[PDB]
Amino acid sequence: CPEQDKYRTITGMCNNRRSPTLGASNRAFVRWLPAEYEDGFSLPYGWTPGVKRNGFPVALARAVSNEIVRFPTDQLTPDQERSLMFMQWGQLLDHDLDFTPEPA
Amino acid sequence: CPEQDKYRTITGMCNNRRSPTLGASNRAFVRWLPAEYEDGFSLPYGWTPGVKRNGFPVALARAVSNEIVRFPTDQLTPDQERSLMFMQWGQLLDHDLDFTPEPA
Amino acid sequence: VNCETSCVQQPPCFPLKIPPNDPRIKNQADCIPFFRSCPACPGSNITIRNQINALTSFVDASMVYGSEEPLARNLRNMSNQLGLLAVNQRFQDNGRALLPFDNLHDDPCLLTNRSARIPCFLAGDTRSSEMPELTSMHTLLLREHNRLATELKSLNPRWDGERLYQEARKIVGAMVQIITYRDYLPLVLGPTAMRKYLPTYRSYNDSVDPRIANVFTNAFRYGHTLIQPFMFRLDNRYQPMEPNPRVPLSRVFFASWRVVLEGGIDPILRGLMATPAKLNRQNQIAVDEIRERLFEQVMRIGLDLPALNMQRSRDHGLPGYNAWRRFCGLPQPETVGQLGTVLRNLKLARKLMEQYGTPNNIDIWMGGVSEPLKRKGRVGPLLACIIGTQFRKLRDGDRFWWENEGVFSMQQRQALAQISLPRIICDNTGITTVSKNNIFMSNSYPRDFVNCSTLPALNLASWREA
Amino acid sequence: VNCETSCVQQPPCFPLKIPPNDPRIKNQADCIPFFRSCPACPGSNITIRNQINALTSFVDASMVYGSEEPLARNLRNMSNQLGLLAVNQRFQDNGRALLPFDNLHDDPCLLTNRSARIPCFLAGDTRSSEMPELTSMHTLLLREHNRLATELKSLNPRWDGERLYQEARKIVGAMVQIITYRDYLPLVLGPTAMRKYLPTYRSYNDSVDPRIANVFTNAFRYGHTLIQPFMFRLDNRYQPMEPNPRVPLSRVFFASWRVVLEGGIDPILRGLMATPAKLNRQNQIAVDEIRERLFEQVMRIGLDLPALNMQRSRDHGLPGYNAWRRFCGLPQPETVGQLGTVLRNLKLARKLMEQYGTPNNIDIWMGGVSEPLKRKGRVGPLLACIIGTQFRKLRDGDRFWWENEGVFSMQQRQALAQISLPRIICDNTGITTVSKNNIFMSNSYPRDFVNCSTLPALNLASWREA
């Protein structure tokens, strides 16, 4: 990595001198906790019919959404102390921090 | 992983149930600190001629061994409080813990 | 294959299965489209599958400039030595710049209004067109970049294109960091979590890991609970922009034609300032515009964003609720009664348990947004821990943090401390009335608003090369 | 490129270069052979290269039973229902079993003595024949397994082979854990490091990651400093076993023929017991038998173990001395004066500064073995931190830890707490005189020895199924 520099690289490369890929683009996320897969290394919970997670059936994401998340739109409560800009900056900021690619 | 077992698997798989490969054989070591490679992801320090580490020339491993490790055997100090079995259990125990494959 | 046209569960697809008696997808065998995130080490039978961040983790406005070199150069106006970002060569917004059009394969934006024929926008990040309000924020920072470069050029005539681009890019990056840590994060976390996870900055620490953590990509989706079911548009006097001031969200996703043909970014920016966010409440988590009708116009059926969040966490092999509570040093409820205590809501806890059986299996997003919000914050303890922990590592582990010694001068830092989102809007739009500080709190016109004229411009004096 | 026969640096070879005025290799065109450790994700332009653990991290005697199912089954006697491990079919050691011979292609053991034609031994781990003293420990444990299976067969007749194998392997496993944490580790770490890194066991915690850390594979090589330049063999009255009581280590590596043809494992075990280990001193770090003549007879050139350890830590991308000190919460010396203070040895710090330029670049093994030893310990603060942290994880994160509730009965744990290496030696050898506990401290005959007849055998009565 360059002796001295005035500006960040575009890829984030060399921000950290000792480990120049940290925070750089096109690198694996860091794991704060070991991953939990059906087979221990790759298949997601919910992939194999009849495979329980820690003693219980895997709840359909859509079932959870329907039973816990769904609510009557006319019950929506406006946040008296937050603007919709609070919502939008979060999304804009999210787009500065992470994008998880998938095959097209 | 079997809902119930009786003994260790030979590979260590399923010792941890939430994360089944932890401690199991033929898996990547965990990183307690982010790796430090010459190019940031794969080349070892000392691989590319003229390329320094943290501002300084990489010392030849053999050179460090010659200058710091080498000593006249006649100066050897017998450990009055340890048996050679202290060394040997160590090696035996290491061989219960890790083996890092290399190509033949 | 195609994860979008079939329900076949084969690589790289992981379609969401439909529960019996669904209120919308009556066909129990149908599904909601889902592509697994690209694995860091394709097809390995040794590695534990992990996912990839395509972006720079740093708060460096890479959503403006890009995180890959081909793109970064393609985003820049290389026709002169003005150091500008390229702007749309087909349309302007009342004389002001719009983002240049992108060139995708089957452009999703084309599909939102077939006759309008307006493609998606090209930006530092591929999602700039996902909703017009996000598009307007992207355009705002593109204008600020070109403004800054123009000013710096009057300031320092000898400065070439590369220098001007880099200097303006550095100021924009500083602006995002300041608005984020000074104005935004304190309102997310609440004062108590702010003090715990974000103590006073001391200096850059090269031993702080700055990478985004896998769980963060799912936990920061707490924001989905803030989304209103409409895109609100207001005219110059902050009144409803007729004939359509409230557009259902299911008809604005990837709707770039609305920025180009329906009045530009000003009506959209006023809507964001003068309308409240949706408040997250335990029996009012997320709206059907994103739960039933997500991407309605560009998909075979409407998606479910909350459900997608949960399937993604599984795709990513993320531990459950209690494992994350433990990671954060928070008590781990093991029974319904204990969960009822933590959530301050036994009914919700009962609901959670009927679906998951154990609090250990609740998906991180679901458990995270279920928790009661911290005082003057908009997330509970678990999300506070995860979000606050991530942003500290992004500040502390950034060699280019705006306050780090050697990045900017003292005089430059003092000038940058005066920046605000409301003034930036004043600098790059036809809006002359903006929100009072803090912009993320203010939400009521005219009470929370003041004239742009009462806000001092950014003082660039200290960027003058002597 | 052939890493054994060529000094060309191309994948997968990383040959150690020879410095000027080398005391042994005068030709700088030469090198010390080195094969890069296999990458977890080969040829990836995404992942940060990592290395592979081929073994179970758990202290489960995998070096006896194997870490892969094919081997594990091939190591077992499958001709009857006794649950035994297969023993050597061509040789015995005074009416006792030897390890079966392995079938290696270019078998290094055969090269240590061409006419004897004794091949390497087959065991749970591939290195059992590396030195005769290790082979003796592998043979001793294999014997204990078959003794246990026999007794258990008289105790519980209905128990098939599989039950006997597994119950025997489970006792052996506890034996390795008990000897390691009760006798060995406290003498590695010393009292203060023991209490700090290994508090009293409570029970199994499944949130404790039991994986071996990459740094451990290099830090635990601390043991290389305890190695004596000879293999010492003593007869029944513990006197020099003529004609060759002190054999140069450069002529014992992979010398399996010596176990088979030169007295078996009794002369070797008595040698480990009644000979002091070498002490690590800052000016007497590691002997030339391993620094100059490592594996001489079984390849083109003698290797240098200390040098291989430093080349290995770079191969593995391991952080330098100060990064590890910081990870451990230890002060980080930045000047030669600071380093001298930490090392309590200015002369050594100067040598280190002169080699590395900065303490930040000191390779982890070098810096680790350079630190002064903790009181009643044989490593300094850094290695104590690294080794103590690893072992706590191996204990607390192991579902089958011998002391975890449910693994053994309260009566079975009482019986196991009475085991010791000396008693195991008495049960599987012709040696009737053994070291007084602690076997890792005792090293002087007759002062530190007692008769086998004075030691209580393991009571398997609580293993009765009835």
Ligand SMILES: *[C@@H]1O[C@H](CO[C@@H]2O[C@@H](C)[C@@H](O)[C@@H](O)[C@@H]2O)[C@@H](O[C@@H]2O[C@H](CO)[C@@H](O[C@@H]3O[C@H](CO[C@H]4O[C@H](CO)[C@@H](O)[C@H](O)[C@@H]4O)[C@@H](O)[C@H](O[C@H]4O[C@H](CO)[C@@H](O)[C@H](O)[C@@H]4O)[C@@H]3O)[C@H](O)[C@H]2NC(C)=O)[C@H](O)[C@H]1NC(C)=O
């Ligand atoms: C079961 O074991 C779990 C693992 O325990 C560790 O390993 C074993 C072998 C022991 O040595 C043990 O001492 C080790 O801790 C254990 O869970 C662990 O519990 C601790 C304490 O609650 C957790 O620490 C907290 O971490 C959060 C998150 O930050 C951490 O992760 C980030 C990202 O990697 C790092 O950058 C941080 O430095 C942390 O490592 C912190 O926010 C939190 O600190 C804050 O709160 C405390 C309390 O006020 C303050 O002191 C701090 O200043 C902060 O304000 C803690 O540091 C740890 O993450 C967690 N690990 C796991 C895997 O869950 C569990 O408790 C054990 N259970 C039992 C019954 O033994």
Ligand SMILES: *[C@@H]1O[C@H](CO[C@@H]2O[C@@H](C)[C@@H](O)[C@@H](O)[C@@H]2O)[C@@H](O[C@@H]2O[C@H](CO)[C@@H](O[C@@H]3O[C@H](CO[C@H]4O[C@H](CO)[C@@H](O)[C@H](O)[C@@H]4O)[C@@H](O)[C@H](O[C@H]4O[C@H](CO)[C@@H](O)[C@H](O)[C@@H]4O)[C@@H]3O)[C@H](O)[C@H]2NC(C)=O)[C@H](O)[C@H]1NC(C)=O
């Ligand atoms: C620069 O930042 C460095 C990283 O700091 C972390 O992240 C920042 C953003 C903050 O959140 C900060 O609070 C975080 O710590 C920082 O280096 C770090 O310093 C800490 C404190 O000394 C180190 O913690 C110690 O770790 C060792 C090793 O064990 C750790 O790792 C294992 C394996 O992953 C875990 O299982 C353990 O739970 C630990 O996490 C421990 O031995 C030690 O604890 C022992 O000693 C203390 C005191 O005697 C006792 O309280 C304990 O009971 C133990 O006996 C600490 O837990 C941390 O490893 C280290 N991280 C890195 C990357 O080096 C550095 O100090 C900062 N510098 C400045 C100038 O700010």
Ligand code: HEM
């Ligand atoms: C206009 C508002 C928003 C959307 C429309 C929207 C949509 C999504 C979608 C479709 C995903 C991916 C779903 C999947 O896993 O298949 C998604 C991911 C993420 N979001 Fe979304 N989002 C809108 C708004 C927000 C806000 C306000 C956020 C934060 C305050 C927010 C965050 C996130 C994050 C962090 C992700 C993951 C991104 C990645 O790929 O790494 N979103 N959102």
Ligand code: HEM
């Ligand atoms: C007879 C005594 C010992 C040896 C002979 C010996 C030799 C080595 C060699 C050749 C390696 C690999 C070097 C390289 O990186 O190229 C090696 C690795 C390890 N050792 Fe060694 N060792 C002898 C003795 C010990 C003792 C007493 C140890 C510990 C107390 C010890 C440890 C280790 C460890 C942990 C490794 C790494 C193993 C792996 O592949 O992961 N050794 N040793």
Ligand SMILES: *[C@@H]1O[C@H](CO)[C@@H](O)[C@H](O)[C@H]1NC(C)=O
């Ligand atoms: C580049 O800049 C000039 C002057 O500002 C402008 O006229 C031109 O349209 C720009 N080119 C692009 C592609 O934006």
Ligand SMILES: *[C@@H]1O[C@H](CO)[C@@H](O)[C@H](O)[C@H]1NC(C)=O
């Ligand atoms: C689509 O865009 C056209 C302009 O091309 C506009 O007239 C029309 O109102 C839009 N259609 C819809 C359904 O809004």
Ligand SMILES: *[C@@H]1O[C@H](CO)[C@@H](O)[C@H](O)[C@H]1NC(C)=O
């Ligand atoms: C298996 O055990 C029987 C009886 O102990 C013995 O005859 C035979 O040698 C053993 N087989 C092997 C391969 O060790």
Ligand SMILES: *[C@@H]1O[C@H](CO)[C@@H](O)[C@H](O)[C@H]1NC(C)=O
């Ligand atoms: C090799 O072993 C044979 C016995 O098979 C023995 O005569 C000879 O001494 C050994 N060779 C060496 C070099 O020690």
Ligand SMILES: [C-]#N
């Ligand atoms: C939202 N992304």
Ligand SMILES: [C-]#N
């Ligand atoms: C040593 N192995």
Ligand SMILES: [Br-]
């Ligand atoms: Br994670």
Ligand SMILES: [Br-]
């Ligand atoms: Br490591």
Ligand SMILES: [Br-]
């Ligand atoms: Br364009």
Ligand SMILES: [Br-]
């Ligand atoms: Br999107």
Ligand SMILES: [Br-]
């Ligand atoms: Br206005």
Ligand SMILES: [Br-]
């Ligand atoms: Br045999």
